[PDB]
Structure 1
Amino acid sequence: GPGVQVETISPGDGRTFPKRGQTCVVHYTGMLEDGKKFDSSRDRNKPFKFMLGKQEVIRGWEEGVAQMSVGQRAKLTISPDYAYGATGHPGIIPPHATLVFDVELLKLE
């Protein structure tokens, strides 16, 4: 799909893909293109949860995680229009930043 490239690190079950209204429980590490880590749920030892279709996360995450199956770990490379765009997130993400996330879909609730 546009805006997000999915490179698999380890496979999921290949059959249980997130549906609209389901809660995705994931572990992630986010980095800028130069490898600078800006956020990681793995460092907090606390999985991150979001409801698919609610737009609680950037578009690249909604569309990238929807292509993953339960148990899958993948590297998502998200273009700036599918992330924080021209503004970025002041003090964390610069303008027009491509973001790289190592995401593991742990389970669906």
Structure 2
Amino acid sequence: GKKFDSSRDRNKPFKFMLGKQEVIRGWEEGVAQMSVGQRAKLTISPDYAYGATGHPGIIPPHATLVFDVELLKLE
């Protein structure tokens, strides 16, 4: 499908705090069940993503998101 964002295209890794409502619910629970070094493919339902409103310009409504994520390290 259509790539909308990649941290690999920046060359700089992305950081976030878990269980602090910083990211979407798909990540919050999808990453919480990932081990260090693991690369996984998260398929996130709209209800766990951007819902019916979406994110205009990037994400259409009712958009199911696919994330290719590798957990590098914890800090």
Assess same fold via TM > 0.5. yes
Quote how far apart the aligned CAs of 1:99 are: 0.2
Structure 2: how far apart are the matches of 1:90 and 1:50? 23
Quote how far apart the aligned CAs of 1:103 are: 0.3
Residue correspondences, number: 75
**Structure showing greater relative contact order (alpha-carbon pairs closer than 8 Å, 6 or more residues apart):** 1
Structure 2: how far apart are the matches of 1:78 and 1:69? 19
1:3-39 CA deviation, whole Å, 9 max, x = no partner?
A: xxxxxxxxxxxxxxxxxxxxxxxxxxxxxxxx10000
Structure 2: how far apart are the matches of 1:95 and 1:76? 19
Quote how far apart the aligned CAs of 1:77 are: 0.3
User: What CA RMSD, in Å, does the superposition of the two structures yield over aligned residues?
Assistant: 0.4
TM-score by length of 2: 0.98
TM-score by length of 1: 0.68
Quote how far apart the aligned CAs of 1:78 are: 0.3
Secondary structure of the residue aligned to 2:8 is helix
1:34-79 CA deviation, whole Å, 9 max, x = no partner?
A: x100000000001000000111110000100000000000000000
Identity of aligned residues (%): 100
Is 1:42 the counterpart of 2:8? The answer is: yes
Segments of 5+ residues of structure 1 without an aligned counterpart are: 1-34
